[PDB]
């Protein structure tokens, strides 16, 4: 089967005229398949999400949203590390990348973070990351 790299490259291709579900869901399927899939997925996603090409980053966030819903204790656990969460904090925060990131991209990240605090309460690092942002005034 095709590699995580191949999937995510199709799924987030800024040439895409619409969402490519075969590739989006194929990414989720594939990271679930191989032992070391989830920590790789999370590395690939973090890079796509920090793209200055907005449609690339937006599609990445849709892949992330999708696989969080579909996969996981292993995927949920990787996303729920500071190793990943820090990369999202970079994108939304004026100290880091926030100044040059579209409001669309930042709002999507903040939505996703809220939804995981509600939907995955066992991932306490996601929750900690979110009230840190809220304490800084980046949310509400």
């Amino acid at each position: 089967p095709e590699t995580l790299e191949a999937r995510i490259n199709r799924a987030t291709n800024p040439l895409n005229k619409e969402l490519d579900w075969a590739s989006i869901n194929g990414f989720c399927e594939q990271l679930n398949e191989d032992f070391e899939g989830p920590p790789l997925a999370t590395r690939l996603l973090a890079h796509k999400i920090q793209s200055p090409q907005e449609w690339e980053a937006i599609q990445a966030l849709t892949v992330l949203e999708t696989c969080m819903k579909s996969c996981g204790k292993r995927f949920h656990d990787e996303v729920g590390k500071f190793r990943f969460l820090n990369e999202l904090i970079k994108v939304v925060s004026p100290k880091y990348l926030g100044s040059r990131t579209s409001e669309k991209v930042k709002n999507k990240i903040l939505e996703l973070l809220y939804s995981w605090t509600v939907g995955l309460p066992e991932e306490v690092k996601i929750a900690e990351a979110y009230q840190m942002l809220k304490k800084q005034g980046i949310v509400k």
Partner: peptide, 9 residues
Amino acid sequence: DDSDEDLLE
């Protein structure tokens, strides 16, 4: 595995 970065504050 239990290891992780520090929270970026």
